[PDB]
Amino acid sequence: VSPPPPIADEPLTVNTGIYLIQCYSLDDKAETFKVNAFLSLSWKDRRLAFDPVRSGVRVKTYEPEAIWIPEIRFVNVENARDADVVDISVSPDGTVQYLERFSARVLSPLDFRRYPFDSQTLHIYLIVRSVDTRNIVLAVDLEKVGKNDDVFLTGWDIESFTAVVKPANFALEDRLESKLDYQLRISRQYFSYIPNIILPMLFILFISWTAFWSTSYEANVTLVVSTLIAHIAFNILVETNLPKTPYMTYTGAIIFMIYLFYFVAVIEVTVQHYLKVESQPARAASITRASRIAFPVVFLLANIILAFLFF
Amino acid sequence: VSPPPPIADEPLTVNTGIYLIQCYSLDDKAETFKVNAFLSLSWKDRRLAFDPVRSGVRVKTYEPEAIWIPEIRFVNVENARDADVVDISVSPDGTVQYLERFSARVLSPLDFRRYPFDSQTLHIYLIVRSVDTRNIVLAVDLEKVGKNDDVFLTGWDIESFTAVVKPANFALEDRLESKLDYQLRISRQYFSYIPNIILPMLFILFISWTAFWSTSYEANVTLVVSTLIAHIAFNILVETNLPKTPYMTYTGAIIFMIYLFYFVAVIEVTVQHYLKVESQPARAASITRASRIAFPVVFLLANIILAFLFF
Amino acid sequence: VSPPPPIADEPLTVNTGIYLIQCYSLDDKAETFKVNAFLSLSWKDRRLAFDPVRSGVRVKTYEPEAIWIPEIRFVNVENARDADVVDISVSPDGTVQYLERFSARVLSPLDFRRYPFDSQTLHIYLIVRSVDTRNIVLAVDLEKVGKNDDVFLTGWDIESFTAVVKPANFALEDRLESKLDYQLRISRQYFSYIPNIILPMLFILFISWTAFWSTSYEANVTLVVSTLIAHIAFNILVETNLPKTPYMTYTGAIIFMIYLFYFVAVIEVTVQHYLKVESQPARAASITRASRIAFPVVFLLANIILAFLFF
Amino acid sequence: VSPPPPIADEPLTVNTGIYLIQCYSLDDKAETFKVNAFLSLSWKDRRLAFDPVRSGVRVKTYEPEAIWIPEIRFVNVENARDADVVDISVSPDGTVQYLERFSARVLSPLDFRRYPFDSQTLHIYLIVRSVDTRNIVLAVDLEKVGKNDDVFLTGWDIESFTAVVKPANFALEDRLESKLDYQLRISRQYFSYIPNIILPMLFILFISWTAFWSTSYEANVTLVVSTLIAHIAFNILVETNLPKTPYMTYTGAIIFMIYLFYFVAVIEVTVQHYLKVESQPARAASITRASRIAFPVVFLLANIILAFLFF
Amino acid sequence: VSPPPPIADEPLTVNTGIYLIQCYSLDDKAETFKVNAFLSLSWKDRRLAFDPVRSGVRVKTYEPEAIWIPEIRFVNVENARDADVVDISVSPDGTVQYLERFSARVLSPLDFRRYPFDSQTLHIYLIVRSVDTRNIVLAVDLEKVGKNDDVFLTGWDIESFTAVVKPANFALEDRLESKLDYQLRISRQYFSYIPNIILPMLFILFISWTAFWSTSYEANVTLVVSTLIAHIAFNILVETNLPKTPYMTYTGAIIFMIYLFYFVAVIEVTVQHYLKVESQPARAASITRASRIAFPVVFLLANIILAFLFF
Ligand SMILES: [Cl-]
Ligand SMILES: [Cl-]
Ligand SMILES: [Cl-]
Ligand SMILES: [Cl-]
Ligand SMILES: [Cl-]
Ligand SMILES: [Cl-]
Ligand SMILES: [Cl-]
Ligand code: NA
Ligand code: NA
Ligand code: NA
Ligand code: NA
Ligand code: NA
Ligand code: NA
């Protein structure tokens, strides 16, 4: 079967629509998400047109094999979509109304700069390759674009699901291609990060600073070194839930900066001890007393600077 | 093949039934479960009706290809169900009796607020899309809804398997849809959590409190800091077996609260030492003596408050 | 194609046999095992019968499509078995001899009460659903039930592979079902658990007890607390290799009990120190001296009691 | 299609050959490896024979469906091989030349006794089941057995790929079976184990022995206990990369033995301290001085004994 | 269908082209990458040639089944590529223009010697096996070789995608094979390794060196032993993200060398203490004072030597 012939030299407009049934498995490391949705296609094939009076029927239902159906593919899927045709309905004027239910693992890049307070725009790219007979152009029927109410993405808030109505028409392998951008805007549920990572990480840091109220070198070494190891554990836990970015993430920046606080705390703990042994505890006392104010102030200001830079 | 024609302007009622053969793999993080069950469908196709006297047979057996079968799909499955038709039996009045055996990975949300003492309602949503010829409505044949005795879900107690008999009829893409709710009520087997997480977590906390019966700052620092690290390990162990919730879980609340106990224990240990060095051990003794009663009392009351809030 | 017609009102007896080719991947957490075996089926279809003299051939080979084959399914498989028909041989009395090679992930529950010294009975349930024409009953041809010599299950000893010859005939959805039980008896290779978990776990415990020969509170705190953390690591390592049971496992019981030994050791270490500071080292000496005998004796007796209760 | 008829009462000899294209994913825990290779089959079917003069062609190319092809299966694959027929060429005498390209996950047991200095013999078992018409026997055409130069197995050295030319002919289910053994000899690349596990493990042990040059019980307790925990971490790291063997592995033996060294070091550290408190430091000095020589000597001799026993 | 017949004794030239649509999942441990691309094939079949005047059409579109298509396979894929034919267009002279969209998991070895500052050349090997009728030779149509702009490989920089235009023609199983090399040059995004592994690893090492400004053996033991354990954790974290190489990697070399620094620091800490107890603190002071300069200088020079050797 060949494509529908043109009235003039116009291209064939295939009206599209994606209706999300299920949404799930957003893999941060892999930068992928799984989707289960309705795909709707509609185009005019004058060859399939009929008189409702003569035929008796108001619409004709065809099996996929029987008629010409445009080869609609997804640009950013890992493997070809697992589709099952729901219905094909031809109107008297030849307006075909195709509907399929698909499932696919979509590969869409993620921006982790403000993690875990980040928001993302997941993409679904519909594409059609023009045939030698005639050029095929994609369109968005906004009435067939949407999502089910029940849809939820674990640990994410689904903001919107819209389509960029004007297609990206370009040449590839000397043939026209019509690309459509379906955008699923989501924003991370940062809540859990606060009692699981942020607050425990701050508690261990504050525990390290109790060495500014101790003259016992042995106790201080234990305090600063132990807490530093707990901070390593938190850093490792965090980097496992994320991919390797060629940029600094918000949480990444905080965690890294905290290493410098542990480093300088060790230096202070060392200096205080050296001076005490050197029989200069008056100078050591001045340094320790200052550190009690310096460490939280410099920590608080550095964090304001980071939050400012990142948001 | 087209759908059965109506007697009047009535919709076609497809009677359904799910009989669970096997149940397994409830993924808490992914909020999914795998099912292996019987699907039964029954509708009246007057076109397939026959006289038992003339034909000789009491029922006629057809191959799926031969007759019209309603396109029944599952709303919340990840990928299309892996089904194999067991039997299709037509009665003389045209009452078709379809049976298939399926397996699917069902996506049903879980409520972790009372974890690990939580109970869940897993869902299986049957759906049918109405055709242009006529509207299709789902029904529950309670005689064909059930589960095998042997069925067990690892680490869960299967309470019930029922169906919400009245379907959720709605419009989607200008077409009628009939949705049915099959509910599998389950409740978690919290036993193992007690000797593996809860009791070990309490033991390390109680060990930290022995610093209230020690004047040795160095020993106290070791006691409170070490146990705190074991508590971090338990927190990390727990959060790996669970997804990121935008709410606090029962175990999550307990674990978080325990961090504050370690923090205040460090403050006490620090205060006691500062005072001792300051040549005020009488004041330090008062604080330590109070802490011996204060720490378990405030812990016990805080837990009563939490259990009350959560249950 | 319809089933073979009966001579009298007898049911159709389908003789079965499973011959294990490969055995592997027993998942303790998932309570599943993968199998790769021969499936043999044999039934009498009088309609396929022929004259050897007239036809020339002694047996006729048919393609699965050509003749009626009973719908034999496995009850406890996750997804439908991946089968490939090896041969179908019809004798001229109409005795069909079907053989297929399959592979499946079988879901069979495991009893961890005596882990790692446990033994299991893995099951393979053959099932047939009776048709409206006539009832189908399963049988075991003991000559076609067995396993290859090479077969081995990693970390397990394969004891036997037998079939419960009398089928479980019952009604389900107003139709007769014939269920057969193929049992693969296995017993765990507990060897590795001794030098990897049991002995290292005992060594750290015995190390903690050296605090009964030390008056240094600071050293004792280090000894008991450190070893307790190593015991947490061993407990966590063990629980990862196992599913959450609503009962206590043998290793689980030992590990849990050991926590109480660490708890009481801390109490002793604390008591001894308090008394020493209180200028009562004579009483502290009595307690420490007793503990040296009490701790191993109570440990040894408690273990005898556990081993007795568990075996 | 039936098998080729025999000239006399001889069996049909199917000449085989495996040419490895790609080799990869040797899973030590699962005892499996993935293969991507050429399968070649050649047998004489006199029914397909032709005169080159009359026909014009020197060889005839057939589609798999058109002619009889022997049912060649792999014994030790997990699931049936993913094969794609490359070519089928019939010579004038009826000598069929079949070639397919396959990929399979082969299950072959591994001997970890000398790990990580072990060598293995991976197996690929070709099998054919004889038909009721005539018996089928496998043969090795050594000219069609080999491997690509590029082939490499990550972390392994590929020694050889040969076939045991004489098949294992036996009865199974009253039918003849011809089994062939394709052996892929490999030897582990033990290099990485030296700077990652062996040397770090020895360093921590030697660090523990510095307690023989210290009279500080508190420091010694820290030295021996800390290093012992690092040794636990190494033992756990090792056992994760390996399956549970009912025998001792070389690395397993070394690691286990090292636990005894830590145990005895604790005993020494304890004894030395007890004696010092008991105001007998002369006796404690003798024990400590001996331990300085005893510990490395006994360690070195024990290792010679192990290496001897294992190799 | 047989291959196109030759004009003279020339081989059939199949012009190829790969256009990368999506690139992803480069597994360092498995040494694999997933690809989603366009495959284009073009050859001359004179049998399909036609007069544009007589036929009316300028090009003819065929279904894969209808005409002869060369059996093009990938050498280094794990399993056979998942391909879907996009278009087949025949020109009047018989120049066939085939296009398919594929997805495959390509196995290409990686060189980790300069990790994480390494660069790689991923390969895609196109291969064709010559038929008995005539020899088939591959060619590169440079106009149909490329990649989409959007293409990105997570944690990698895509440098180029070119093809080695002259094929590797060789004999295999007495038949000609034409192999083509498609090279995807990539270079690692080493950024993240600096704040996550390199700098934290240096910080803990520098913390260990504060023991050169402390006379407290107990504090020094804590400093050097604790930091050494954090270094073990970093070594383990690194080796999990990498496969077992029979060579030293850059990061591997640094990490290994750092163990020697911890070992010698322990020796210094031990020596200093022994001398102090031996009432020789003047000699111990000389050693400690030297170590303060020696340790960073020898560390810095050793690193220059390593960087030099590795780059
Ligand atoms: Cl697609
Ligand atoms: Cl479905
Ligand atoms: Cl509505
Ligand atoms: Cl409607
Ligand atoms: Cl099955
Ligand atoms: Cl096979
Ligand atoms: Cl391929
Ligand atoms: Na079509
Ligand atoms: Na149908
Ligand atoms: Na059949
Ligand atoms: Na065939
Ligand atoms: Na310490
Ligand atoms: Na073809």
PDB file of N, CA, C and O in Angstrom, chain A residues 59-63 85-89 97 99, chain B residues 1-6 9-12 14 47 68-73 127-137 170 172-178:
ATOM      1  N   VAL A  59     -19.235   5.178   9.714  1.00  0.00           N
ATOM      2  CA  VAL A  59     -17.785   4.989   9.815  1.00  0.00           C
ATOM      3  C   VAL A  59     -17.413   3.538   9.487  1.00  0.00           C
ATOM      4  O   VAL A  59     -18.187   2.621   9.772  1.00  0.00           O
ATOM      5  N   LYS A  60     -16.216   3.335   8.920  1.00  0.00           N
ATOM      6  CA  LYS A  60     -15.710   2.007   8.575  1.00  0.00           C
ATOM      7  C   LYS A  60     -14.484   1.687   9.421  1.00  0.00           C
ATOM      8  O   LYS A  60     -13.582   2.518   9.543  1.00  0.00           O
ATOM      9  N   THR A  61     -14.452   0.477   9.999  1.00  0.00           N
ATOM     10  CA  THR A  61     -13.354  -0.003  10.842  1.00  0.00           C
ATOM     11  C   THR A  61     -12.469  -0.971  10.047  1.00  0.00           C
ATOM     12  O   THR A  61     -12.968  -1.970   9.536  1.00  0.00           O
ATOM     13  N   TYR A  62     -11.162  -0.670   9.948  1.00  0.00           N
ATOM     14  CA  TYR A  62     -10.178  -1.476   9.217  1.00  0.00           C
ATOM     15  C   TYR A  62      -9.138  -2.073  10.154  1.00  0.00           C
ATOM     16  O   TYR A  62      -8.878  -1.512  11.218  1.00  0.00           O
ATOM     17  N   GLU A  63      -8.522  -3.189   9.724  1.00  0.00           N
ATOM     18  CA  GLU A  63      -7.420  -3.863  10.407  1.00  0.00           C
ATOM     19  C   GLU A  63      -6.142  -3.198   9.906  1.00  0.00           C
ATOM     20  O   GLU A  63      -6.123  -2.773   8.746  1.00  0.00           O
ATOM     21  N   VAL A  85      -2.547  -1.929  18.697  1.00  0.00           N
ATOM     22  CA  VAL A  85      -3.589  -1.127  18.060  1.00  0.00           C
ATOM     23  C   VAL A  85      -4.924  -1.376  18.758  1.00  0.00           C
ATOM     24  O   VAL A  85      -5.323  -2.523  18.974  1.00  0.00           O
ATOM     25  N   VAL A  86      -5.552  -0.277  19.184  1.00  0.00           N
ATOM     26  CA  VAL A  86      -6.833  -0.238  19.879  1.00  0.00           C
ATOM     27  C   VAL A  86      -7.969  -0.112  18.842  1.00  0.00           C
ATOM     28  O   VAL A  86      -8.916  -0.898  18.897  1.00  0.00           O
ATOM     29  N   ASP A  87      -7.862   0.851  17.889  1.00  0.00           N
ATOM     30  CA  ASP A  87      -8.891   1.097  16.875  1.00  0.00           C
ATOM     31  C   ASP A  87      -8.398   1.912  15.677  1.00  0.00           C
ATOM     32  O   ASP A  87      -7.508   2.748  15.814  1.00  0.00           O
ATOM     33  N   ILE A  88      -9.008   1.663  14.500  1.00  0.00           N
ATOM     34  CA  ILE A  88      -8.806   2.381  13.239  1.00  0.00           C
ATOM     35  C   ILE A  88     -10.208   2.663  12.685  1.00  0.00           C
ATOM     36  O   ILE A  88     -10.920   1.721  12.357  1.00  0.00           O
ATOM     37  N   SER A  89     -10.626   3.938  12.661  1.00  0.00           N
ATOM     38  CA  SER A  89     -11.956   4.336  12.198  1.00  0.00           C
ATOM     39  C   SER A  89     -11.900   5.380  11.074  1.00  0.00           C
ATOM     40  O   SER A  89     -11.394   6.489  11.270  1.00  0.00           O
ATOM     41  N   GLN A  97      -8.924   7.623  11.748  1.00  0.00           N
ATOM     42  CA  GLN A  97      -8.734   7.842  13.171  1.00  0.00           C
ATOM     43  C   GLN A  97      -8.173   6.585  13.818  1.00  0.00           C
ATOM     44  O   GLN A  97      -8.907   5.659  14.174  1.00  0.00           O
ATOM     45  N   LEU A  99      -5.732   4.721  16.736  1.00  0.00           N
ATOM     46  CA  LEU A  99      -5.441   4.738  18.163  1.00  0.00           C
ATOM     47  C   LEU A  99      -4.758   3.448  18.564  1.00  0.00           C
ATOM     48  O   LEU A  99      -5.224   2.358  18.233  1.00  0.00           O
TER      49      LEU A  99
ATOM     50  N   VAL B   1     -14.181  -8.779  12.023  1.00  0.00           N
ATOM     51  CA  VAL B   1     -15.386  -9.057  12.810  1.00  0.00           C
ATOM     52  C   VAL B   1     -15.820  -7.840  13.644  1.00  0.00           C
ATOM     53  O   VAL B   1     -15.004  -7.236  14.347  1.00  0.00           O
ATOM     54  N   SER B   2     -17.112  -7.490  13.544  1.00  0.00           N
ATOM     55  CA  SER B   2     -17.736  -6.361  14.233  1.00  0.00           C
ATOM     56  C   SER B   2     -18.373  -6.790  15.578  1.00  0.00           C
ATOM     57  O   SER B   2     -18.585  -7.983  15.775  1.00  0.00           O
ATOM     58  N   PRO B   3     -18.691  -5.862  16.514  1.00  0.00           N
ATOM     59  CA  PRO B   3     -19.292  -6.283  17.792  1.00  0.00           C
ATOM     60  C   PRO B   3     -20.743  -6.776  17.681  1.00  0.00           C
ATOM     61  O   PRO B   3     -21.389  -6.472  16.676  1.00  0.00           O
ATOM     62  N   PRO B   4     -21.299  -7.496  18.694  1.00  0.00           N
ATOM     63  CA  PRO B   4     -22.700  -7.951  18.596  1.00  0.00           C
ATOM     64  C   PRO B   4     -23.695  -6.796  18.476  1.00  0.00           C
ATOM     65  O   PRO B   4     -23.520  -5.794  19.163  1.00  0.00           O
ATOM     66  N   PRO B   5     -24.719  -6.893  17.598  1.00  0.00           N
ATOM     67  CA  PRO B   5     -25.676  -5.787  17.459  1.00  0.00           C
ATOM     68  C   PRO B   5     -26.663  -5.739  18.627  1.00  0.00           C
ATOM     69  O   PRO B   5     -27.006  -6.792  19.177  1.00  0.00           O
ATOM     70  N   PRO B   6     -27.126  -4.538  19.039  1.00  0.00           N
ATOM     71  CA  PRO B   6     -28.038  -4.475  20.195  1.00  0.00           C
ATOM     72  C   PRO B   6     -29.511  -4.746  19.896  1.00  0.00           C
ATOM     73  O   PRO B   6     -30.003  -4.399  18.815  1.00  0.00           O
ATOM     74  N   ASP B   9     -31.394   0.044  22.502  1.00  0.00           N
ATOM     75  CA  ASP B   9     -30.223   0.930  22.528  1.00  0.00           C
ATOM     76  C   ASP B   9     -29.336   0.662  23.770  1.00  0.00           C
ATOM     77  O   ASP B   9     -28.619   1.554  24.243  1.00  0.00           O
ATOM     78  N   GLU B  10     -29.355  -0.593  24.270  1.00  0.00           N
ATOM     79  CA  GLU B  10     -28.591  -0.994  25.454  1.00  0.00           C
ATOM     80  C   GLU B  10     -27.082  -1.185  25.172  1.00  0.00           C
ATOM     81  O   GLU B  10     -26.707  -1.493  24.033  1.00  0.00           O
ATOM     82  N   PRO B  11     -26.197  -1.029  26.187  1.00  0.00           N
ATOM     83  CA  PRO B  11     -24.779  -1.297  25.937  1.00  0.00           C
ATOM     84  C   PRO B  11     -24.477  -2.790  26.109  1.00  0.00           C
ATOM     85  O   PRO B  11     -25.287  -3.516  26.695  1.00  0.00           O
ATOM     86  N   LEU B  12     -23.331  -3.261  25.584  1.00  0.00           N
ATOM     87  CA  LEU B  12     -22.933  -4.663  25.728  1.00  0.00           C
ATOM     88  C   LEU B  12     -22.234  -4.884  27.090  1.00  0.00           C
ATOM     89  O   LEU B  12     -21.220  -4.243  27.383  1.00  0.00           O
ATOM     90  N   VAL B  14     -19.998  -7.001  29.397  1.00  0.00           N
ATOM     91  CA  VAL B  14     -18.969  -8.032  29.439  1.00  0.00           C
ATOM     92  C   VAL B  14     -18.718  -8.348  30.906  1.00  0.00           C
ATOM     93  O   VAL B  14     -18.235  -7.499  31.661  1.00  0.00           O
ATOM     94  N   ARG B  47     -25.473 -13.488  17.292  1.00  0.00           N
ATOM     95  CA  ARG B  47     -25.027 -13.979  15.978  1.00  0.00           C
ATOM     96  C   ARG B  47     -24.418 -15.390  16.048  1.00  0.00           C
ATOM     97  O   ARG B  47     -24.380 -16.099  15.043  1.00  0.00           O
ATOM     98  N   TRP B  68     -15.720 -12.474  17.448  1.00  0.00           N
ATOM     99  CA  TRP B  68     -15.477 -11.162  18.041  1.00  0.00           C
ATOM    100  C   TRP B  68     -15.245 -11.326  19.551  1.00  0.00           C
ATOM    101  O   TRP B  68     -16.080 -11.919  20.249  1.00  0.00           O
ATOM    102  N   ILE B  69     -14.116 -10.790  20.048  1.00  0.00           N
ATOM    103  CA  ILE B  69     -13.732 -10.820  21.458  1.00  0.00           C
ATOM    104  C   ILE B  69     -13.409  -9.383  21.918  1.00  0.00           C
ATOM    105  O   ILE B  69     -12.638  -8.689  21.240  1.00  0.00           O
ATOM    106  N   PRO B  70     -14.021  -8.912  23.038  1.00  0.00           N
ATOM    107  CA  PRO B  70     -13.781  -7.532  23.479  1.00  0.00           C
ATOM    108  C   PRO B  70     -12.341  -7.279  23.881  1.00  0.00           C
ATOM    109  O   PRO B  70     -11.715  -8.136  24.512  1.00  0.00           O
ATOM    110  N   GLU B  71     -11.819  -6.106  23.475  1.00  0.00           N
ATOM    111  CA  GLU B  71     -10.458  -5.653  23.769  1.00  0.00           C
ATOM    112  C   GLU B  71     -10.364  -5.135  25.210  1.00  0.00           C
ATOM    113  O   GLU B  71     -10.529  -3.930  25.455  1.00  0.00           O
ATOM    114  N   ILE B  72     -10.149  -6.082  26.160  1.00  0.00           N
ATOM    115  CA  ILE B  72      -9.999  -5.863  27.610  1.00  0.00           C
ATOM    116  C   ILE B  72      -8.525  -5.649  27.912  1.00  0.00           C
ATOM    117  O   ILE B  72      -7.703  -6.516  27.608  1.00  0.00           O
ATOM    118  N   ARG B  73      -8.198  -4.499  28.501  1.00  0.00           N
ATOM    119  CA  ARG B  73      -6.830  -4.138  28.860  1.00  0.00           C
ATOM    120  C   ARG B  73      -6.761  -3.810  30.358  1.00  0.00           C
ATOM    121  O   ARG B  73      -7.795  -3.640  31.017  1.00  0.00           O
ATOM    122  N   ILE B 127     -10.237  -2.614  32.005  1.00  0.00           N
ATOM    123  CA  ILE B 127     -10.811  -1.521  31.226  1.00  0.00           C
ATOM    124  C   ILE B 127     -11.228  -1.992  29.830  1.00  0.00           C
ATOM    125  O   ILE B 127     -10.586  -2.888  29.269  1.00  0.00           O
ATOM    126  N   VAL B 128     -12.323  -1.408  29.293  1.00  0.00           N
ATOM    127  CA  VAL B 128     -12.793  -1.654  27.934  1.00  0.00           C
ATOM    128  C   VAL B 128     -13.140  -0.318  27.263  1.00  0.00           C
ATOM    129  O   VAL B 128     -13.708   0.572  27.903  1.00  0.00           O
ATOM    130  N   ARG B 129     -12.750  -0.165  25.993  1.00  0.00           N
ATOM    131  CA  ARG B 129     -13.074   1.048  25.264  1.00  0.00           C
ATOM    132  C   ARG B 129     -14.226   0.726  24.331  1.00  0.00           C
ATOM    133  O   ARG B 129     -14.181  -0.285  23.625  1.00  0.00           O
ATOM    134  N   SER B 130     -15.285   1.553  24.375  1.00  0.00           N
ATOM    135  CA  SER B 130     -16.472   1.384  23.543  1.00  0.00           C
ATOM    136  C   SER B 130     -16.119   1.624  22.078  1.00  0.00           C
ATOM    137  O   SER B 130     -15.227   2.425  21.766  1.00  0.00           O
ATOM    138  N   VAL B 131     -16.784   0.881  21.188  1.00  0.00           N
ATOM    139  CA  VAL B 131     -16.587   0.990  19.745  1.00  0.00           C
ATOM    140  C   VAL B 131     -17.622   1.942  19.146  1.00  0.00           C
ATOM    141  O   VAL B 131     -18.604   2.292  19.823  1.00  0.00           O
ATOM    142  N   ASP B 132     -17.404   2.366  17.882  1.00  0.00           N
ATOM    143  CA  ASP B 132     -18.328   3.279  17.217  1.00  0.00           C
ATOM    144  C   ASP B 132     -19.694   2.643  16.948  1.00  0.00           C
ATOM    145  O   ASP B 132     -20.708   3.353  16.929  1.00  0.00           O
ATOM    146  N   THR B 133     -19.721   1.304  16.784  1.00  0.00           N
ATOM    147  CA  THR B 133     -20.942   0.521  16.575  1.00  0.00           C
ATOM    148  C   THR B 133     -21.814   0.599  17.847  1.00  0.00           C
ATOM    149  O   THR B 133     -22.951   1.066  17.774  1.00  0.00           O
ATOM    150  N   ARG B 134     -21.262   0.184  19.010  1.00  0.00           N
ATOM    151  CA  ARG B 134     -21.975   0.229  20.287  1.00  0.00           C
ATOM    152  C   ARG B 134     -21.043   0.326  21.522  1.00  0.00           C
ATOM    153  O   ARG B 134     -19.865  -0.010  21.461  1.00  0.00           O
ATOM    154  N   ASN B 135     -21.619   0.785  22.639  1.00  0.00           N
ATOM    155  CA  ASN B 135     -20.973   0.975  23.920  1.00  0.00           C
ATOM    156  C   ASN B 135     -20.816  -0.327  24.685  1.00  0.00           C
ATOM    157  O   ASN B 135     -21.725  -1.159  24.676  1.00  0.00           O
ATOM    158  N   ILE B 136     -19.629  -0.516  25.311  1.00  0.00           N
ATOM    159  CA  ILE B 136     -19.316  -1.709  26.089  1.00  0.00           C
ATOM    160  C   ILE B 136     -19.139  -1.331  27.567  1.00  0.00           C
ATOM    161  O   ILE B 136     -18.424  -0.370  27.885  1.00  0.00           O
ATOM    162  N   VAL B 137     -19.839  -2.070  28.452  1.00  0.00           N
ATOM    163  CA  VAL B 137     -19.861  -1.878  29.905  1.00  0.00           C
ATOM    164  C   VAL B 137     -19.366  -3.155  30.604  1.00  0.00           C
ATOM    165  O   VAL B 137     -19.782  -4.254  30.227  1.00  0.00           O
ATOM    166  N   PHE B 170     -16.719   6.459  32.301  1.00  0.00           N
ATOM    167  CA  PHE B 170     -16.267   7.812  31.992  1.00  0.00           C
ATOM    168  C   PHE B 170     -15.941   7.937  30.508  1.00  0.00           C
ATOM    169  O   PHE B 170     -15.832   6.933  29.803  1.00  0.00           O
ATOM    170  N   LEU B 172     -13.330   9.380  27.535  1.00  0.00           N
ATOM    171  CA  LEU B 172     -11.926   9.594  27.272  1.00  0.00           C
ATOM    172  C   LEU B 172     -11.794   9.570  25.778  1.00  0.00           C
ATOM    173  O   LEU B 172     -12.153   8.568  25.160  1.00  0.00           O
ATOM    174  N   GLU B 173     -11.292  10.664  25.190  1.00  0.00           N
ATOM    175  CA  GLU B 173     -11.132  10.760  23.745  1.00  0.00           C
ATOM    176  C   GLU B 173     -12.486  10.505  23.076  1.00  0.00           C
ATOM    177  O   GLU B 173     -12.611   9.616  22.229  1.00  0.00           O
ATOM    178  N   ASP B 174     -13.519  11.236  23.529  1.00  0.00           N
ATOM    179  CA  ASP B 174     -14.899  11.140  23.069  1.00  0.00           C
ATOM    180  C   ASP B 174     -15.419   9.704  22.937  1.00  0.00           C
ATOM    181  O   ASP B 174     -16.232   9.421  22.066  1.00  0.00           O
ATOM    182  N   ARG B 175     -14.984   8.806  23.815  1.00  0.00           N
ATOM    183  CA  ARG B 175     -15.471   7.431  23.795  1.00  0.00           C
ATOM    184  C   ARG B 175     -15.649   6.907  25.184  1.00  0.00           C
ATOM    185  O   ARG B 175     -14.863   7.222  26.062  1.00  0.00           O
ATOM    186  N   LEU B 176     -16.684   6.107  25.388  1.00  0.00           N
ATOM    187  CA  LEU B 176     -16.973   5.554  26.691  1.00  0.00           C
ATOM    188  C   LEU B 176     -15.966   4.477  27.091  1.00  0.00           C
ATOM    189  O   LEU B 176     -15.568   3.647  26.285  1.00  0.00           O
ATOM    190  N   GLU B 177     -15.590   4.487  28.363  1.00  0.00           N
ATOM    191  CA  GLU B 177     -14.657   3.548  28.962  1.00  0.00           C
ATOM    192  C   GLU B 177     -15.260   3.005  30.246  1.00  0.00           C
ATOM    193  O   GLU B 177     -15.796   3.771  31.045  1.00  0.00           O
ATOM    194  N   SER B 178     -15.200   1.687  30.427  1.00  0.00           N
ATOM    195  CA  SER B 178     -15.722   1.014  31.608  1.00  0.00           C
ATOM    196  C   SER B 178     -14.537   0.418  32.385  1.00  0.00           C
ATOM    197  O   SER B 178     -13.867  -0.484  31.889  1.00  0.00           O
TER     198      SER B 178
END
